[PDB]
Every structure is written in structure tokens, then in C-alpha cells.
Design a protein around this nucleic acid. Structure first.
Ligand SMILES: [Mg+2]
Ligand SMILES: [Mg+2]
Ligand SMILES: [Mg+2]
Ligand SMILES: [Mg+2]
Ligand SMILES: [Zn+2]
Lengths: 202, 52, 141, 190, 161, 196
RNA sequence: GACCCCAGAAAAGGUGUUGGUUGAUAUAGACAGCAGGACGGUGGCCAUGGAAGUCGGAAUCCGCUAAGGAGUGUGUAACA
């Protein structure tokens, strides 16, 4: 019922999102993009591991769902159901068409959704305890088999999912350049009202 | 009714071995890679099943 | 053989049961007890313990003295129904004390750790007691 | 990577005498002579002393493929040495479940006759390699004593008997019967 | 002898463990070759024997007939050994010089059968001749002409019905 | 924790060897931990038994004891599976007390047997289900009194040979103690001295 | 194997060889071999037809220790 992924592997069709022009699009296979302990604050999960994809191709929505399940089964089995947070950093926005059965009026109707990646772009993200690095690489290594192209595993120097480096994360939090809320942190520039400096720092 | 000391002697040559999962090749008990090029010396090995 | 020696153990206690006990399988070795011996077997081993109560039985021709080896979890579960600090100390007094022990702080630690399944003195699990073992650590000798 | 030099040395006992003719080692131990050429490899062989009689091989710019042949040669020469001072004796037992395996040793221990293997009517005749003599031992109920000076020939003849008694079309985890090598020792036990 | 011992041991062990009626209500029930309760033979070849016949004939070649043969009945089975050169029994596993001897059962029961079987099976005609007269077996028809296994079929039946 | 443990053993051998001047060089033969468990307790009142890697000992009491020589005579003697028993009382008593604390070790499969044991002809008392074990070794046994019976004493195992797998377990059921050995002293030490 | 278009190949593997990156162990003696020991509470708790280290749910200690997991696998109905 679905064509092989080799028929839509390449980004050659001028991004075609679901809009008022492209209606009647079936729902994408992947609806959940965050798994594990999505509530762990910032500190228990300082280790962030990424799956970057070094090919300009498009990954389908069913492949994104399949790799997410594959990474969830392993991370739960090994690190524990509460020992990790997963974030699929790819959304299947592009819509692929199919010309069902000659060439007259060949413009196809939507059939599925894919996500287009670049040479440097993370597909999946896992934050967890520091001692789970080997388990994170293995979980990503297995989920990589569910994608058409070639991907790399990279242990990011940044603290968890936060955009700030792990070595300096603790000391700016200490001097309150960052405050923790939710899964990430809030940068606090020293250029706002002074009353907001004094409700902090006190 | 084979006496056990000779029974272990025969199993050493018939039973106690590893089998390649890709080409079924009979390999020594300590084999880690298959010795045959037809499978590409794969390390996917399994012990030979016992009759127990 | 001590005029009889049919030493074998059994893993029942508390409720009499008799039929529910595994005694019929263990009966033939002595050839003495049968059903009547089983009934008297649970009579002394009725209470303390009220639990699994593994006992080592020394034979008495027809009767069978049911001396119970003081198993750790057995005595711990028997006492627990909770501080029992002195009660865990006496529970750590009557049993054989081999433990591959050296001093009294050792046995207080080892018996203290065995009762992790059923906690320990009021609001503290029996491990943070194990580190700072000073109170009564030498109260047995 | 090419090593400057890979070499290793073997010691020669007093009783046995080794002479070199190119890459051809000849040993003159008490139990006969053993000769084996090595011209399929490129090493240099030398006798070092006149009193302790040391045999040395060198490799001189080999990669790891041909570095492995330095100790292969020395192992062979040691096998030559042991084969002429102590000889090779491959005891091997015959195990059978139901049908006894009857072995008849024909002329001067060079032909063996496997009769009742799995109760077949086919007689298996296997010819020992030259210089290898097989026999039926008196110590054990049923086992072959095939002795010799060359380990390659003795072990190959032992393999000829072992592969001759192979159960076909049956489960070989059962039907464990046949003749297999039990121990590999020497003669004179020294 | 070993496999015979293994079987009777296997029969005796299973009699005792389930047949709780040991010495008591029926006495000792276990089979024993020395007691005469076990026999050897082959229904296909129509010949069988027990320790009585060999002991009975050994005495004949050697009322009161009962008592003397039951003691030799005892001697045949078990670990008791017999020295052929000494020509007598011995409880020691080895002769005084140091020559270990076969046990009494294999020595004086199985050897004549093994000699009889091998002679006919290998068609050693002179040996069958010396054996039949040394064994004193009556020669009926149809066997003087037929050799081999059917002849072994005949001589064992006639000797040991 | 490896570096800490190794250093801790250095401190332990240092501050204990400073105290006890009398020692025996004692070899750990095929000696179970459980049976070492009881000698440690059995000597706990009198002495203390300590040992580890023989290289551990060698570097410990060669480079840190330049202050107290006469223990260099331990250096060529600490070889093989060797140990220290650290005693303060008379050597003669702990000598025979060590000899008195012997274990009736069983027969492990694969172990060599330096001692000879042979089962006599006695009534074992085992039930009528263990005959197949005596069958495996060729013992002719008929059952008497509902118990297994050895008709004639049969050789069990000769010195200097390998224990059979089915043989070794048979000795356990018979409860008869096979070859048994434990802690054995080789050399002694007291303020720069060695004896038998 | 052998040259733009071009006339044929992928994912995935290799203890075949070569180079490279990173980490670790090791005279306080690594690695691999050959040889010993591999304990007590405790057949640890809850589940049980029987689950004793090894079908499972959790907990992950203590003492002797050189070291021994309240267990890596084979094995057992459970043991052993
Ligand atoms: Mg198709
Ligand atoms: Mg297009
Ligand atoms: Mg070699
Ligand atoms: Mg078939
Ligand atoms: Zn293969």
C-alpha cells in the first residue's frame, strides 16, 4: 500500500507543506516526538547524544516513527523507563504525491509526509545520566538502521538539550546567568529592568 | 550404552562445535569468525545444538 | 546412630495444616512419624515461628524434637508484625553467632542488613544504621 | 610496515644432528632421518654453534603475512627433532554403541581393515602413509597405536582412519561411533 | 559376566525398592544366580542352562547328590576365582606367583561355551570332533552333514535343552 | 578503588609486620575458602593470617623496610602460593594447632589424588535407588536389609591418578572422606631466622 | 582491477591487510595460556505446584576477606 522509500528518498520537489493549497493530506505516522522523562528538570540529564545525518535526503514519517520506537525499546530496557528523555528533532512537513494509475493530468494527490534533512542536522536527541553514554550510543546506533541514508552519533558538548556548553553550565547557573525551568533554562541578560535583577539575586 | 569417557571423546569431534549462522559451517568451539569466504568471515556464530 | 538420626529439615511452621505440609514426601526417610508423627511435629513448632519456620529435626524414636535453626529472615519476619532495636539485638543473641564474624559490630551489621526486606528501627532503612555503628555495637559481649 | 628483521632460534639436542642444504633441513636423530625442504618460503637458515648446535632463521624485511612463517618453520624443525629423538605415537580409541568395530592390521602395519562399522557389509581399507606403522594395542580393549617419525604423516594417517568411519544420513550428535584420536604422545616418554 | 551382573543387580534393586514385602510376609524374594533363580540361554537357539546343570555335571565328572551340588552352585557365581594351572578355586584375585586368574563363572561356565561357539563358527572340524566326545553329547541325524551356525544350533540344543 | 586497595594492603602489611616478629611461611594448597574461613576464626584468638600477591609482599617488605633489615631473608622464600601467619605466642603450640586443624576435604572432579582410599565391604545404608552409581564403576552390589551392599572390598582410587566424575560424586554419597589436606607450613621466621 | 559522457550496483558485514582517532591495563608486574581457591548470614523478601544465585517483581548489604556478584552462563522438577 506504500511505495518503497527509494521512490521519495531525494529532496527534489520544492517544499510542499500542508496548507490551504494542499488539502486532503493524510495524517503523518509520527505524532509523539518526546518520550521518557520529559519532566526531568535540567540537572539529572546533563549528557546529550545526537543522531546527525550527513546526507541531503528526506526521511519518511513512518521511518521516523519506526526509529523512535526502536530507540524507546532499548533505552527503557537498559537505562530504565525513567532514566532518559528522547526528542525527535525532525517533523514530517513535506508532502509527497502519487500519480495513481496515462501521463495526461499527471499531477499526483498527497499520499504521505516526509522530513527533509541537510548534511548537518540532528534527527534524534537523547538526554540522560552521564554514565549512560554507552547505552545512548547503542540506542542511537540501532535506530539508525531504520533510516535510508548514513548517519553519525555525536555526544554533544552541551548540557542536555540546553544550548550552553556543559563545562560552563554549572558556573553560570551558580552566578545566575541561567535559571532552570522546565526541561531547559532561561538566559538572563543583564540589560532589563533593575527591579527584575533584584527579584532575582535576592 | 557408550562408556562416558569415550562418549565425551566422540562428542569432541561430532557435537562440541560452533556453527556459522550465515552458511552453517562447522567451526571449532572457540571460533569467533567463520573461516569461509562465502559468508565474509562473519562473526554471527552459534553453538551446535545439543541432543539433550 | 545416636539411637536414631533422621536429621532432615522441613520448611513449614505457624498454621498446623498437616496435610498442607510437605511431610508425606519426607515421611518415609524416618519410617517412624507417619501422620501421627506429623501432627506432633507441628505441635511444638506451632508458634515462634508463625511463618516459614524452617526447622532441623532430631529424632526421638517415634517423637521428633523440632529445634528450629534461627534463620535470619525467619526471626526477622517472626518478630515483625517498628523499632525492635533491642529485640533485633536479642534476635542477634540466641542464634549460633558464627556469621564468619569477628566482633559484635559485625553481627549487628550483617543481621541488620539481612532485614532490609522489612525495614528497621522506626523511620530509617537498615543501611544508614550500618555506616555509623557505635550505639550498642559492643553490647552483646 | 616492513620489519628490519624478525628472527627466532631453536635448540638442537646433542643426540640429534642437523645439516643444511639451502632451505632443506635434514635431521639425523637416533630413530632414523627426517628431511624437509622449505624453498616455498624466503628466509635464511644458519647453524650457529659447533658445541650447542643452534638453528636460527631470519626474515629480513617481511610484512606480517610472511613474519608468521618464521615460527612456522621453527615449529616444523622442532617437530622434526622430536620425531627423530622420541617419535610420534597417536593412540586412538574406537567407540561404538552397538556393533563392535573390528580392525585387522594387514601387512607390516601399513594397511588397516575396519570390518563391522555400524554393522555394514562394506569393508573399509585405508593405507597408512609410508613410514607410519599402525598396530592394535594390548593395554586397552580396542585402540590403534600408529607410530612414526613424521608428525604430518602420522597425523594424516590417523585422519585417514577417522574420516573413513563417518556416519552418513544419520544424526551425528547421536550415532557417535567411529574411531577418533584419543591422545597424541611420543615414544620413549623422555 | 559384567552385563549379567548388571541386569540381576538392576532386577534386584527394583524388587527391593517397590517390593516392600521383604523378609517377613514372604521372606527374601530377590532373584540370585547362586540361588538358581536366574537362567541363561536363547529361545531362538532353543538352548538354555542355569548354574545347576554345570555344577551337576562337574560333580559327575568329578540323597547326598543334592547337598554337594548346591555348594558348588555357590562356587560358580560371584567374585570367587579359579586357577587352571593350580586346578582349584581361590578367593585371592591373583595366584601366589602373581598371575591373576579369571573368576569362577567365566572360567568354568563360559569357557566351554566360548570354545564350543568359536570352534563351530570358524569351521574347525577337528575341534568340533574332540569337543563333542569330551562333552559326551548324543549325535542324532541331520547334524553330521550340516555345519556352521545351524550346527551350533544343534549341538547347543542337544547338550543344553 | 584499585589504587586505594593496593595502597591499603601496603599499609596493612606494613603496620602489622612491624608488630608481629614471629612468622611462618605457609603454603595455600587446594584449600577451600570455607575451610580457610574457620581457621581464620580458629586462630583469631591466637594469631592472624594474612597474605596476597607474592609480588605484593616482595615490594612491600623490600623497599619500605630499610629501617629494619633481617627480613631480607624472606625475599628468596616467598615463592608460589605462599602466606604469612602472624603470631605472638609460642611457635610450637600454633604449629600443632595448625596441624590439628585439618579438613576432611571431599574429592573434586578433575583434581589429582595423592592419597589412596579403598571402600571396604560394609553396609552403606543408602536407599535402593543409588545402585546405578556402583554400576558405573563396576562394583557388584546386591541389596541387603533394603540397603546397598558391597560384596567384596574393591579398590576405589590409587594415588597419583585422576578422579572420575561419576567416581568423585560416589565418594560423597558414601560420605567416606577421600584424600584430605589443608594449610601446610613450609618455613618459619623470627628476628632473622629460618627453620623447617 | 583497470580512466569524463559511459555503458552496470546498494544498504549491511570481514580477527584479510594498511593508516588514523580515542580510551584503558601493566615491574605495586599486565594480556593470553597452564593451576588453585570462588565463602556465612542466606534454600536472602514477594510471588510457589518447585523454584535454593541463575522462569520472574522489586530491592544491591554485611562479615571473613587476596577475592568471591546476595550471581556470568551451562545444568536440574527443585537440588546438586
Ligand atoms: Mg516492488
Ligand atoms: Mg520535480
Ligand atoms: Mg605448539
Ligand atoms: Mg533421517
Ligand atoms: Zn560462515
Amino acid at each position: 500500500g506504500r511505495r518503497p522509500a527509494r521512490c521519495y528518498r531525494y529532496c527534489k520537489n520544492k517544499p510542499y507543506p500542508k496548507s490551504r493549497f494542499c488539502r486532503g493530506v493524510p495524517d503523518a505516522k509520527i505524532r509523539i516526538f518526546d518520550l521518557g522523562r520529559k519532566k526531568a528538570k535540567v540537572d539529572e540529564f546533563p549528557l546529550g547524544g545526537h543522531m546527525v545525518s550527513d546526507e541531503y535526503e528526506q526521511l519518511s514519517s513512518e521511518a521516523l516513527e519506526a526509529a523512535r520506537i526502536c530507540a524507546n525499546k532499548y533505552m527503557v530496557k537498559s537505562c530504565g523507563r525513567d532514566g532518559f528523555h528522547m526528542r525527535v528533532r525532525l517533523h514530517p512537513f513535506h508532502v509527497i504525491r502519487i500519480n495513481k494509475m496515462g501521463m495526461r493530468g499527471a499531477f499526483g494527490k498527497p499520499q504521505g509526509t516526509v522530513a527533509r534533512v541537510h548534511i548537518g542536522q540532528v534527527i534524534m536527541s537523547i538526554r540522560t545520566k552521564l554514565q549512560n553514554e554507552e547505552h545512548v550510543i547503542e540506542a542511537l546506533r540501532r535506530a539508525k538502521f531504520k533510516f535510508p541514508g548514513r548517519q553519525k552519533i555525536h555526544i554533544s558538548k552541551k548540557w542536555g538539550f540546553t544550548k550552553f556548553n556543559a563545562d560552563e553550565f554549572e558556573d553560570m547557573v551558580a552566578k545566575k546567568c541561567l535559571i532552570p525551568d522546565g526541561c531547559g533554562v532561561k538566559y538572563v541578560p543583564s540589560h532589563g529592568p533593575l527591579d527584575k535583577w533584584r527579584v532575582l539575586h535576592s | 550404552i557408550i562408556e562416558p569417557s569415550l562418549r565425551q571423546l566422540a562428542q569432541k569431534y561430532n557435537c562440541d562445535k560452533m556453527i556459522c549462522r550465515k552458511c552453517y559451517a562447522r567451526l571449532h568451539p572457540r571460533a569467533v569468525n567463520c573461516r569461509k569466504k562465502k559468508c565474509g568471515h562473519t562473526n554471527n556464530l552459534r553453538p551446535k545444538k545439543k541432543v539433550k | 546412630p545416636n539411637e536414631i538420626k533422621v536429621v532432615y529439615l522441613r520448611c513449614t511452621g505457624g498454621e498446623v495444616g498437616a496435610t498442607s505440609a510437605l511431610a508425606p514426601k519426607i515421611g518415609p526417610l524416618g519410617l517412624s512419624p507417619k501422620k501421627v508423627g506429623d501432627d506432633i511435629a507441628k505441635a511444638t513448632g506451632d508458634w515462634k515461628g508463625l511463618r516459614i519456620t524452617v526447622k532441623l529435626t532430631i529424632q526421638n524414636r517415634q517423637a521428633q524434637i523440632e529445634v528450629v535453626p534461627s534463620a535470619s529472615a525467619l526471626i526477622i519476619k517472626a518478630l515483625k508484625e517498628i523499632t525492635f532495636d533491642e529485640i533485633v539485638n536479642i534476635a542477634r543473641q540466641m542464634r549460633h553467632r558464627s556469621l564468619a564474624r569477628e566482633l559484635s559490630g559485625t553481627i549487628k551489621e550483617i543481621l541488620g542488613t539481612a532485614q532490609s526486606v522489612g525495614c528497621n528501627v522506626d523511620g530509617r532503612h537498615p543501611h544508614d544504621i550500618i555506616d555509623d555503628i557505635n550505639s550498642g555495637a559492643v553490647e552483646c559481649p | 610496515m616492513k620489519t628490519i628483521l624478525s628472527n627466532q632460534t631453536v635448540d638442537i639436542p646433542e643426540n640429534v644432528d642437523i645439516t643444511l642444504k639451502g632451505r632443506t633441513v635434514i635431521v639425523k636423530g637416533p630413530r632414523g632421518t627426517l628431511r624437509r625442504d622449505f624453498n616455498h618460503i624466503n628466509v635464511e637458515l644458519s647453524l650457529l654453534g659447533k658445541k650447542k648446535k643452534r638453528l636460527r632463521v631470519d626474515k629480513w624485511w617481511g610484512n606480517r603475512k610472511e613474519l608468521a612463517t618464521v615460527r612456522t618453520i621453527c615449529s616444523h624443525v622442532q617437530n622434526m627433532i622430536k620425531g627423530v629423538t622420541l617419535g610420534f605415537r597417536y593412540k586412538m580409541r574406537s567407540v561404538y554403541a552397538h556393533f563392535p568395530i573390528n580392525v585387522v592390521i594387514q601387512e607390516n602395519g601399513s594397511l588397516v581393515e575396519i570390518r563391522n562399522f555400524l554393522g555394514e557389509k562394506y569393508i573399509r581399507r585405508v593405507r597408512m602413509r609410508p613410514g607410519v606403522a599402525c598396530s592394535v594395542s594390548q593395554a586397552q580393549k580396542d585402540e590403534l597405536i600408529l607410530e612414526g617419525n613424521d608428525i604430518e604423516l602420522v597425523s594424516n594417517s590417523a585422519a585417514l582412519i577417522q574420516q573413513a568411519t563417518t556416519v552418513k544420513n544419520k544424526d551425528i550428535r547421536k550415532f557417535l561411533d567411529g574411531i577418533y584420536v584419543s591422545e597424541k604422545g611420543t615414544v620413549q616418554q623422555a | 559376566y559384567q552385563t549379567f551382573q548388571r541386569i540381576v543387580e538392576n532386577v534386584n534393586v527394583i524388587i527391593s525398592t517397590y517390593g516392600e514385602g521383604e523378609s517377613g510376609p514372604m521372606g527374601n524374594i530377590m532373584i540370585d544366580p547362586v540361588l538358581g533363580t536366574v537362567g541363561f540361554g536363547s529361545g531362538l537357539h532353543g538352548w538354555a542352562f542355569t548354574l545347576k546343570q554345570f555344577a551337576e555335571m562337574y560333580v559327575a565328572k568329578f540323597a547326598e547328590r543334592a547337598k554337594k551340588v548346591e555348594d558348588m552352585m555357590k562356587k560358580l557365581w560371584g567374585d570367587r576365582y579359579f586357577d587352571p594351572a593350580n586346578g582349584k578355586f581361590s578367593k585371592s584375585a591373583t595366584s601366589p606367583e602373581g598371575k591373576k586368574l579369571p573368576r569362577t563363572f567365566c572360567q568354568l561356565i563360559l569357557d566351554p561355551i566360548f570354545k564350543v561357539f568359536d570352534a563351530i563358527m570358524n569351521f574347525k572340524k577337528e575341534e568340533t570332533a574332540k569337543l563333542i566326545e569330551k562333552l559326551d553329547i548324543k549325535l542324532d541325524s541331520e547334524d553330521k552333514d550340516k555345519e556352521g551356525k545351524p550346527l551350533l544350533k544343534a549341538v547347543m540344543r542337544r547338550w543344553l535343552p | 578503588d584499585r589504587a586505594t586497595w593496593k595502597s591499603n594492603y601496603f599499609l596493612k602489611i606494613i603496620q602489622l609486620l612491624d608488630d608481629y616478629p614471629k612468622c611462618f611461611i605457609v603454603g595455600a594448597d587446594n584449600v577451600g575458602s570455607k575451610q580457610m574461613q574457620q581457621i581464620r576464626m580458629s586462630l583469631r584468638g591466637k594469631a592472624v593470617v594474612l597474605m596476597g600477591k607474592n609480588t605484593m609482599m616482595r615490594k612491600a617488605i623490600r623497599g619500605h623496610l630499610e629501617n629494619n633489615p633481617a627480613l631480607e631473608k624472606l625475599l628468596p622464600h616467598i615463592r608460589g602460593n605462599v602466606g604469612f601467619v602472624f603470631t605472638k605466642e609460642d611457635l610450637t603450640e600454633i604449629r600443632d594447632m595448625l596441624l590439628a586443624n585439618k579438613v576432611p576435604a571431599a574429592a573434586r572432579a578433575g583434581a589429582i589424588a595423592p592419597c589412596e582410599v579403598t571402600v571396604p565391604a560394609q553396609n552403606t545404608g543408602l536407599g535402593p535407588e543409588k545402585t546405578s552409581f556402583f554400576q558405573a564403576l563396576g562394583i557388584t552390589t546386591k541389596i541387603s536389609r533394603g540397603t546397598i551392599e558391597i560384596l567384596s572390598d574393591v579398590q576405589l582410587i590409587k594415588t597419583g591418578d585422576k578422579v572420575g566424575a561419576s567416581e568423585a560424586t560416589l565418594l560423597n554419597m558414601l560420605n567416606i572422606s577421600p584424600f584430605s589436606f589443608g594449610l601446610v607450613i613450609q618455613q618459619v621466621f623470627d628476628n632473622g631466622s629460618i627453620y623447617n
